[PDB]
Amino acid sequence: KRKGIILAGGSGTRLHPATLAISKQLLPVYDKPMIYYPLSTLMLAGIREILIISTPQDTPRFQQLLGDGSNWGLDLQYAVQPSPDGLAQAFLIGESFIGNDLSALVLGDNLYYGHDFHELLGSASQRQTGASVFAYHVLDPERYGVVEFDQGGKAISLEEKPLEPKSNYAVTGLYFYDQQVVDIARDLKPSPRGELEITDVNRAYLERGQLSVEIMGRGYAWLDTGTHDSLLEAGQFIATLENRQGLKVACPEEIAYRQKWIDAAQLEKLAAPLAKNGYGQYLKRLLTETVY
Amino acid sequence: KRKGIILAGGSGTRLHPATLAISKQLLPVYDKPMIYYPLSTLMLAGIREILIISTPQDTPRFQQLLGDGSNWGLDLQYAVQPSPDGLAQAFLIGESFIGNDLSALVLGDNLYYGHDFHELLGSASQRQTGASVFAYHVLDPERYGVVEFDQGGKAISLEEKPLEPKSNYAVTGLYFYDQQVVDIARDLKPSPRGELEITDVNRAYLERGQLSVEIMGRGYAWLDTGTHDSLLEAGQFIATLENRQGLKVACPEEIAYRQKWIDAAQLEKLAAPLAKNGYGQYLKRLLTETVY
Amino acid sequence: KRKGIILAGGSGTRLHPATLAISKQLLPVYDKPMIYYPLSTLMLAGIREILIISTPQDTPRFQQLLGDGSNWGLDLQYAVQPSPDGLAQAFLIGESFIGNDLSALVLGDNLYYGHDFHELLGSASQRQTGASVFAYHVLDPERYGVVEFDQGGKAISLEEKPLEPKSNYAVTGLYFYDQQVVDIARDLKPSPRGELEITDVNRAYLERGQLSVEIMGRGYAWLDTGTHDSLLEAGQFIATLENRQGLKVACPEEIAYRQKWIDAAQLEKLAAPLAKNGYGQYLKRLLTETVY
Amino acid sequence: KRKGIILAGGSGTRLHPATLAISKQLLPVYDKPMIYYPLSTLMLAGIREILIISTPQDTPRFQQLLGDGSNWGLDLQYAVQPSPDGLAQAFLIGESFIGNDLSALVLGDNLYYGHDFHELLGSASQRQTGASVFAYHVLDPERYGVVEFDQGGKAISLEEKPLEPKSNYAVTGLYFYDQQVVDIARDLKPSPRGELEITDVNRAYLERGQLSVEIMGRGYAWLDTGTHDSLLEAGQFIATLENRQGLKVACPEEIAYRQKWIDAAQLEKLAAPLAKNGYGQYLKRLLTETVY
Ligand SMILES: O=P(O)(O)O[C@H]1O[C@H](CO)[C@@H](O)[C@H](O)[C@H]1O
Ligand SMILES: O=P(O)(O)O[C@H]1O[C@H](CO)[C@@H](O)[C@H](O)[C@H]1O
């Protein structure tokens, strides 16, 4: 049993004044709220019990939007990150929710799309020791945690936001950990940047010969919705796909329904209140069409 | 002296589940909140005293966001629309804020761009008797109040959302009224569609020979941000303009600064708290560059 | 050994007047000509000997753009389709180029993207008997050849452009055939619509128990660039991906280089003439970076 | 009488390999070929007699597409620019076509949109002495001819692509000239960059007190379609406008029809051959609808 964490906190300024009226993870990406994406990512990994971490001001809202998750067959819980001192704090804030289980952490503004994405998730989720992360070739690695490989395809280092990247592979914001993470996190010291870095956690596993780094090929799409532009590009990306397929990307109800975490009846209940619009209309159509 | 009303109420149902997270009028259009646009529209018309109407749940937010307007040289007030019974209710709800003055009403999801927009606004604003509206050729008139013209360019009828439009000219969501509006509004009867229609208000002025209908040419851009798609198209429209010009569209601070409703000092104060981002950076640059 | 055909003909009037200036398959999709996409598709399927079919007016151009293929390790040939009498004509027109080999046919305005696309293609290409096609859930099946499945996932019918589609699965424009196709094509009679239909070809295989229909999941992206809008959406789709990754989609030189159909030296030669721009810059960077 | 020139030459390597396939000024912007835009610009300025300059390979094509202009009430002629030695060569190459008349020069990849564009053009076109140019605030002036104003709104310098721009006002690619241009051009010496620069031509008029520089306000849109990205942004810009209005931007037939250069009958003839698609459908609808 792995548990999941969505870290959806974070500093508004960049987005201000657009986010003067809402946290970033509540803005829509095309037709549904941002947080549905990463949420639906953990769901496709088979994770049902998930803790959502946000700012004090934003928690109640997330809560107002997702509830406890029982309607989607999930078990959701919440917690607060008073101040943005590093993603790695997630493990401290979430220490008691994790207990002695396996876990996974996904950042609230990461958005993933692609064929067999669940088999890919599956490999990592099913591992029971060490940590796994993913690597994705990008144009501006400098903006991310960067991982270097040797000629044998083996990972040999990680640097966070380097001025001189040793490769073009970035480590995305989806991480799988075993039971050693909490403790590892407990010994970190704030970076100069003054944060507790997930990169440092990852490196720790690396220094022990226990970091697994799988490639996410160029056939997948990994987008981050952190700037006005990117938000827009992602919004257009989904809309292109959705309109072409007549299917939705990252619709939690559908995924729950497909994993048998809720049944045809629950699904109908979910749709009723949304019937006046396409979303509900979509949910309804799902009960009468096989989708492979 | 004309007073202004922004009707920003609204059953968010359509834009669901996104608006499950925030009223429509708080979502961003590219880089600032939707409401800035229509607000900036009244501003360009010379109007400083404005009432904002919204749902009960949304009011406090709007309030949290704009304040009383003093920082921008405005005088903002607020009111509630318990239930979406027609735009025309705005005049009842707003009867005492209007008093015996001229007024103007603009819908919160209407977005206007174009050269000399302000002279255009000015013609109407400066009229002191009757009402003025604007007409804009569109592809799907059926979705709007439609106005018909005779061979002489004169307006001869108005139908709201007709199955068979008599023209391709829609009447946009910006309206100027004299002192007769409140009483006219007092005698309306809900439409079948069960609402008090602005179109009925406009028709009343028409049946008296007092409705002025100016054309807004194809050289302007009138967009409504009421669906996921249109929200996205508008976001991309502004982004294209803003990135090309290095100027913003509908930035209230700038407009206040240009009308001399606030001075260089106040402007600087407004920017300080925003300095970490481009918005503030933008505001600052405005104090040292002449922009014709 | 399978041979390939790209059918890039037709008048393509849905794009008038853009195409008064060139054929549809020469217009760019973001940053390279349309025809590169399907071309690159056959290439990923392992196919090096390809016949390109087009209108009489367009052939020289294509021929002016791709040459004989030797620079990319291919063997390209050309042939004409005097008049748009059905995709199935491709097999008549191409009867002698096919000879007694296995073949594949891809339409010029179909564009494919996604993880493991090359294994997917590989399944079908390595089959040596019968036919294989792909089915893709879409919003408007009525526009395409539609395939229906039973409860057991087995295909049980094909209809071209039905008014009442039996499913939402469209058959895309990528087809794999054994040696029976030519003769099958020789016995077709023009449809009412007045064309020799691929759908009929497919049906013939079906009626013999020899049509293989694999599902292309919602994790892939199949777009057709036949209208102004779709052209534009695709362009923005590729641009989003390319700019995010620092990699190109459907760049024939790269693919040839990865299949060892050309070597580092050839690749360098290819890049020289393009050095003043990014495309060449891209090709150059490929010789010094490992890309998993 | 002013005569016009469209300089639509060059390689446009920035558009490789899309432009291998065809010259830049043939690619579509959304729904019609690029060259229609600047063409339609001169048309709105009242200019009917136009010389189109292009590369030797591209001329026949342009000629294949536009003819001699009689169908649109124009008089079109062609000439070649063997090598890209500066825009200013346009005046040499076009010396005999201009004769002793007033003239105007517009670059092939400049695109213009906005309210009263046609009065703006009119001011300049009706002047009969000196030269006029327009200035547009932009984000990256370094890329263009840049003009500096004094506190009094008066132009006081022009620099082409400066490393340190003295302002954010770029001079767009539309120029009006009196009879002194040819001779002025005859004395230019190639710039270091090895071109005969329009900026030098402009500067000459400036040094004599005869250069008029009008501001094109932020209410207009000036875009250039010289890169893949910009091409794509422009396409989406026009599509947003066209689909909202049910009207086209830069449709030469319409403009001819509105200036009475052709009549209803000619217009019908023009539409026939295009009836199978929207463009022609558009042209037809124009005969029965008044568009203010
Ligand atoms: O969002 P941040 O804190 O700038 O960066 C975080 O996000 C990125 C993924 O989105 C990671 O690659 C960085 O290692 C992580 O520190
Ligand atoms: O937004 P509604 O209530 O469908 O319609 C309202 O908005 C439109 C403008 O956006 C107007 O044309 C309608 O006449 C007005 O009734």
Ligand SMILES: O=P(O)(O)O[C@H]1O[C@H](CO)[C@@H](O)[C@H](O)[C@H]1O
């Ligand atoms: O492009 P066409 O001739 O309308 O139709 C062709 O295109 C589609 C794919 O693009 C196929 O699904 C159709 O079966 C085929 O006939």
Ligand SMILES: O=P(O)(O)O[C@H]1O[C@H](CO)[C@@H](O)[C@H](O)[C@H]1O
């Ligand atoms: O296209 P070019 O040759 O780099 O630049 C040309 O175009 C610009 C407008 O597009 C002008 O501002 C420049 O002065 C002119 O030389």
